[PDB]
Ligand binder design. Structure first.
Ligand SMILES: *CC(=O)N1CC2(C1)CN(S(=O)(=O)c1ccc(Br)cc1)CCO2
Ligand SMILES: *CC(=O)N1CC2(C1)CN(S(=O)(=O)c1ccc(Br)cc1)CCO2
Ligand SMILES: [Cl-]
Ligand SMILES: [Cl-]
Ligand SMILES: [Mg+2]
Ligand SMILES: [Mg+2]
Ligand SMILES: [Mg+2]
Ligand SMILES: [Mg+2]
Ligand SMILES: [Mg+2]
Ligand SMILES: [Mg+2]
Lengths: 9, 236, 236, 9
């Protein structure tokens, strides 16, 4: 449903 | 505040321990303590600050969305009146989320951004500023919703201008900024076409620069490029 | 404290909302507020109290174990000295865990157990008392480790005696008590044989009583029986 | 590694 933003890396 | 008596190196050490223990509220308080020592942060320390606060606010955002959905269902025709509790509790969680965003924005304003002169540091902190205004925008409904949205846009735009002049198109910070600005455009600014254009141009320019990279840098850049493609798949 | 001005029904409503939002610290504070109204709790309200605190202490126990493992690795030969930070942070998490256990024990002592006269309520609260002493025992190392272990044992034993006289062998509370007392014996009291005996006798007596149950009660009892079998597989 | 105790239900 919601767009993906930067993840934790 | 409470971390004033602890050494900077001990705050960083304990932030790493709190990460391993999945104690993200503690991790954030250790990193806020480290920032307040007044010294600039290295790349690894910016990562610890970013991971801590993203996990804390990410929990709050997930909770807020569950409660907002319940509240919206309550306010439809056919819905039995249940009293003020759903709104009150959504408000409690919203206020706590706003408080975490204001804490991060305050660290960036006092005084991380002004001392950041290298591209990696300045672009990272301006991206962070855009992200936390974006989280405030997600819950904003009043007379300041437009100014909050404009604050996020201005931060992301300043970061974009520096990134395009100072970093290669495959730099992970540059890629992550463009990913999150494209999310801003689609999810906040009602600009899906700008979102798709940004994600496409970013992906194409990175693809063309992959040949310059080592195996390990390649793996880093292609990870974020896959996220741009996942969004383009979702949006088109 | 802070929940004194909220209606009991609104505290229960908000505990259910906090469960849906996975906000377990809030859920626990709402349920502590409800208990402090002074009225007995129904079965569903005991469940909300149990879920909230088990999730909070479960996070603390997981964090404590990660930190204790790191600390133990530090104190071996060949390990470079890193300073007091690992011990200090394990101590911080330990103290917070102890505080949550003391909060629960205090609610049971003031005044949930003394007002509990039906078997389901009295057995549940005595099991809870045993569980939170067990969590204190997990981290105890001083001159009170033996008395903490004995406190857990006494609570579980009082619950066992009531459960065997007042409930059928398939009752979920009776089964869950016997499961956790068997864990006490194996993991805390250095009594693996007592653990295996209890888990075997409990499983066999429940199997023999399953024929008396409805389809829905059967599903509930067999779930816990599978946990007894998983432990017997692990222990033998 | 560790024995299973009652879960949340
Ligand atoms: C070296 C440096 O300053 N940093 C901060 C970072 C490493 C990168 N940022 S980020 O938000 O720019 C980001 C980029 C790429 C990914 Br997959 C995730 C996040 C996060 C903190 O670490
Ligand atoms: C009806 C009643 O008083 N309760 C409290 C409970 C329902 C059961 N307990 S428990 O710890 O006895 C338990 C039994 C079985 C399982 Br699978 C899990 C926990 C937990 C709270 O709800
Ligand atoms: Cl509230
Ligand atoms: Cl500490
Ligand atoms: Mg110093
Ligand atoms: Mg109706
Ligand atoms: Mg509000
Ligand atoms: Mg009242
Ligand atoms: Mg050495
Ligand atoms: Mg201690």
């Amino acid at each position: 449903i919601r767009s993906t933003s930067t993840p934790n890396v | 505040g409470a971390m004033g008596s602890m050494e900077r190196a001990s705050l960083i050490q304990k932030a790493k321990l709190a990460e391993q223990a999945e104690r993200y509220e503690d991790m954030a308080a250790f990193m806020k303590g480290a920032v307040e020592k007044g010294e600039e942060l290295s790349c690894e320390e910016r990562n610890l600050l970013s991971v801590a606060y993203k996990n804390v606010v990410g929990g709050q955002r997930a909770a807020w969305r569950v409660l907002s959905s319940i509240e919206q269902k309550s306010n439809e025709e056919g819905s039995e009146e249940k009293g003020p509790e759903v709104r009150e509790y959504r408000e409690k969680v919203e206020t706590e989320l706003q408080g975490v965003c204001d804490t991060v924005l305050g660290l960036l304003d006092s005084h991380l951004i002004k001392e950041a002169g290298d591209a990696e540091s300045r672009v990272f902190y301006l991206k962070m500023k855009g992200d936390y205004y974006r989280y405030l925008a997600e819950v904003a409904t009043g007379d300041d919703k437009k100014r909050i949205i404009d604050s996020a846009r201005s931060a992301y735009q300043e970061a974009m201008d520096i990134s395009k002049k100072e970093m290669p198109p495959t730099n992970p910070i540059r890629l992550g900024l463009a990913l999150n600005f494209s999310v801003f455009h689609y999810e906040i600014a009602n600009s899906p076409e700008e979102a798709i254009s940004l994600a496409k141009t970013t992906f194409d320019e990175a693809m063309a620069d992959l040949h310059t990279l080592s195996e390990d840098s390649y793996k880093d850049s292609t990870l974020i490029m896959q996220l741009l493609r996942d969004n383009l798949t979702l949006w088109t």
